[PDB]
C-alpha cells in the first residue's frame, strides 16, 4: 500500500492492532511523529510465528 | 512504596508474580543480591500491554 500526501500519526497505530511492541530499524518508534518521509510503503502479509 | 532498613532477597521476587523476566537498567538482575542501596522505591501501576 502506497502512503503519501497525508499526515501520519503513528501513536494511533497501537489502537488499530493488538501488537505488543514495534520493531524498527534505523529509526525509533518514539521519534516517528517528529519526522518526514518522501513516501511510505505498508507491506501486509501473514506468516508463522517462528 | 518506600523500602529501607531491611534485607532484600530479590531471588524470591519470581515467586511473588508470574513475570517472565526482569528488565533492569544500569544493573543486572543476577547481581542484585550482591549490592547495597541507600533506599529502594517500588512504583506500582497498571497499563496496557503496548
Ligand atoms: C475495524 O473496523 C471495524 C468495522 O469494519 C470496527 O468495528 C473496528 O472497531 C475496527 N477496529 C479497530 C481496532 O478500531
Ligand atoms: C498472595 O496472598 C495470598 C493471600 O493474601 C496468598 O494465598 C498467596 O499465596 C499470595 N501469593 C503468592 C504468589 O504467594
mmCIF file of C-alpha atoms and ligand atoms in Angstrom:
data_model
loop_
_atom_site.group_PDB
_atom_site.id
_atom_site.type_symbol
_atom_site.label_atom_id
_atom_site.label_comp_id
_atom_site.label_asym_id
_atom_site.label_seq_id
_atom_site.Cartn_x
_atom_site.Cartn_y
_atom_site.Cartn_z
ATOM 1 C CA UNK A 1 0.000 0.000 0.000
ATOM 2 C CA UNK A 2 1.369 3.393 -1.050
ATOM 3 C CA UNK A 3 1.021 6.151 1.566
ATOM 4 C CA UNK A 4 1.736 9.753 0.574
ATOM 5 C CA UNK A 5 0.269 13.266 0.718
ATOM 6 C CA UNK A 6 -1.091 12.768 4.232
ATOM 7 C CA UNK A 7 -0.299 13.440 7.886
ATOM 8 C CA UNK A 8 0.752 10.275 9.723
ATOM 9 C CA UNK A 9 0.054 9.922 13.456
ATOM 10 C CA UNK A 10 1.830 6.679 14.348
ATOM 11 C CA UNK A 11 0.780 6.920 18.013
ATOM 12 C CA UNK A 12 -2.726 5.779 17.000
ATOM 13 C CA UNK A 13 -1.333 2.625 15.362
ATOM 14 C CA UNK A 14 -1.410 0.894 18.757
ATOM 15 C CA UNK A 15 -5.204 1.233 18.713
ATOM 16 C CA UNK A 16 -5.558 -0.458 15.318
ATOM 17 C CA UNK A 17 -3.907 -3.791 16.159
ATOM 18 C CA UNK A 18 -3.140 -5.555 19.476
ATOM 19 C CA UNK A 19 0.595 -5.840 18.839
ATOM 20 C CA UNK A 20 2.859 -5.753 21.878
ATOM 21 C CA UNK A 21 5.630 -3.508 20.540
ATOM 22 C CA UNK A 22 7.240 -2.042 17.440
ATOM 23 C CA UNK A 23 10.396 -3.364 15.758
ATOM 24 C CA UNK A 24 12.091 -0.502 13.905
ATOM 25 C CA UNK A 25 15.464 -0.444 12.139
ATOM 26 C CA UNK A 26 17.407 2.768 11.614
ATOM 27 C CA UNK A 27 14.738 4.753 13.480
ATOM 28 C CA UNK A 28 12.922 4.734 16.796
ATOM 29 C CA UNK A 29 9.142 4.355 17.214
ATOM 30 C CA UNK A 30 9.354 7.196 19.735
ATOM 31 C CA UNK A 31 10.537 9.740 17.141
ATOM 32 C CA UNK A 32 8.286 8.731 14.221
ATOM 33 C CA UNK A 33 5.898 11.631 14.878
ATOM 34 C CA UNK A 34 8.783 14.123 14.557
ATOM 35 C CA UNK A 35 9.992 13.094 11.080
ATOM 36 C CA UNK A 36 9.014 13.476 7.432
ATOM 37 C CA UNK A 37 9.209 10.900 4.659
ATOM 38 C CA UNK A 38 9.013 11.133 0.882
ATOM 39 C CA UNK A 39 6.847 8.008 0.627
ATOM 40 C CA UNK A 40 5.605 5.292 2.978
ATOM 41 C CA UNK A 41 5.038 1.665 1.981
ATOM 42 C CA UNK A 42 2.843 -0.680 4.024
ATOM 43 C CA UNK A 43 3.507 -4.344 3.214
ATOM 44 C CA UNK A 44 0.910 -6.694 4.707
ATOM 45 C CA UNK A 45 1.088 -10.483 4.889
ATOM 46 C CA UNK A 46 0.605 -13.478 7.192
ATOM 47 C CA UNK A 47 3.317 -15.933 8.259
ATOM 48 C CA UNK A 48 4.028 -18.419 11.021
ATOM 49 C CA UNK A 49 5.208 -17.275 14.432
ATOM 50 C CA UNK A 50 8.638 -18.891 14.126
ATOM 51 C CA UNK B 1 6.363 2.325 48.406
ATOM 52 C CA UNK B 2 9.485 3.213 50.396
ATOM 53 C CA UNK B 3 11.768 0.265 51.211
ATOM 54 C CA UNK B 4 14.615 0.750 53.687
ATOM 55 C CA UNK B 5 16.178 -0.762 56.816
ATOM 56 C CA UNK B 6 15.645 -4.323 55.602
ATOM 57 C CA UNK B 7 17.414 -7.209 53.876
ATOM 58 C CA UNK B 8 16.234 -7.661 50.284
ATOM 59 C CA UNK B 9 16.292 -11.124 48.685
ATOM 60 C CA UNK B 10 15.343 -10.405 45.072
ATOM 61 C CA UNK B 11 15.577 -14.094 44.106
ATOM 62 C CA UNK B 12 12.211 -14.674 45.824
ATOM 63 C CA UNK B 13 10.544 -11.988 43.683
ATOM 64 C CA UNK B 14 9.961 -14.595 40.964
ATOM 65 C CA UNK B 15 7.662 -16.434 43.383
ATOM 66 C CA UNK B 16 5.511 -13.362 44.052
ATOM 67 C CA UNK B 17 4.404 -12.642 40.475
ATOM 68 C CA UNK B 18 4.344 -14.773 37.287
ATOM 69 C CA UNK B 19 6.501 -12.390 35.260
ATOM 70 C CA UNK B 20 8.706 -13.932 32.590
ATOM 71 C CA UNK B 21 11.882 -11.903 33.142
ATOM 72 C CA UNK B 22 13.361 -8.767 34.667
ATOM 73 C CA UNK B 23 14.172 -5.562 32.769
ATOM 74 C CA UNK B 24 16.964 -3.726 34.593
ATOM 75 C CA UNK B 25 18.889 -0.616 33.537
ATOM 76 C CA UNK B 26 22.374 0.132 34.827
ATOM 77 C CA UNK B 27 22.400 -3.129 36.806
ATOM 78 C CA UNK B 28 21.864 -6.833 36.268
ATOM 79 C CA UNK B 29 19.157 -8.919 37.979
ATOM 80 C CA UNK B 30 21.855 -11.535 38.574
ATOM 81 C CA UNK B 31 23.924 -9.246 40.828
ATOM 82 C CA UNK B 32 21.093 -7.620 42.816
ATOM 83 C CA UNK B 33 21.710 -9.890 45.819
ATOM 84 C CA UNK B 34 25.351 -8.727 45.992
ATOM 85 C CA UNK B 35 24.698 -4.969 46.249
ATOM 86 C CA UNK B 36 23.561 -2.385 48.786
ATOM 87 C CA UNK B 37 21.272 0.588 48.255
ATOM 88 C CA UNK B 38 20.522 3.686 50.305
ATOM 89 C CA UNK B 39 16.789 3.484 49.567
ATOM 90 C CA UNK B 40 14.507 1.409 47.346
ATOM 91 C CA UNK B 41 11.327 2.704 45.707
ATOM 92 C CA UNK B 42 8.610 0.365 44.426
ATOM 93 C CA UNK B 43 6.265 2.094 41.969
ATOM 94 C CA UNK B 44 3.162 0.036 41.174
ATOM 95 C CA UNK B 45 0.609 0.708 38.443
ATOM 96 C CA UNK B 46 -1.376 -0.909 35.624
ATOM 97 C CA UNK B 47 -1.100 -0.049 31.922
ATOM 98 C CA UNK B 48 -1.829 -1.590 28.545
ATOM 99 C CA UNK B 49 0.486 -4.174 27.028
ATOM 100 C CA UNK B 50 1.556 -1.959 24.125
HETATM 101 C C1 LIG C 1 -12.115 -2.283 12.382
HETATM 102 O O1 LIG C 1 -13.278 -1.997 11.639
HETATM 103 C C2 LIG C 1 -14.474 -2.442 12.245
HETATM 104 C C3 LIG C 1 -15.608 -2.287 11.255
HETATM 105 O O2 LIG C 1 -15.142 -2.553 9.953
HETATM 106 C C4 LIG C 1 -14.679 -1.668 13.550
HETATM 107 O O3 LIG C 1 -15.828 -2.102 14.241
HETATM 108 C C5 LIG C 1 -13.482 -1.909 14.461
HETATM 109 O O4 LIG C 1 -13.547 -1.133 15.628
HETATM 110 C C6 LIG C 1 -12.179 -1.569 13.740
HETATM 111 N N1 LIG C 1 -11.049 -1.927 14.557
HETATM 112 C C7 LIG C 1 -10.424 -1.092 15.407
HETATM 113 C C8 LIG C 1 -9.263 -1.697 16.156
HETATM 114 O O5 LIG C 1 -10.756 0.072 15.575
HETATM 115 C C1 LIG C 2 -0.780 -13.615 47.964
HETATM 116 O O1 LIG C 2 -1.507 -13.589 49.171
HETATM 117 C C2 LIG C 2 -2.497 -14.592 49.271
HETATM 118 C C3 LIG C 2 -3.349 -14.314 50.490
HETATM 119 O O2 LIG C 2 -3.499 -12.925 50.660
HETATM 120 C C4 LIG C 2 -1.809 -15.959 49.292
HETATM 121 O O3 LIG C 2 -2.742 -17.014 49.331
HETATM 122 C C5 LIG C 2 -0.993 -16.122 48.015
HETATM 123 O O4 LIG C 2 -0.239 -17.305 48.023
HETATM 124 C C6 LIG C 2 -0.030 -14.949 47.838
HETATM 125 N N1 LIG C 2 0.638 -15.040 46.567
HETATM 126 C C7 LIG C 2 1.829 -15.634 46.368
HETATM 127 C C8 LIG C 2 2.327 -15.604 44.945
HETATM 128 O O5 LIG C 2 2.475 -16.165 47.260
#
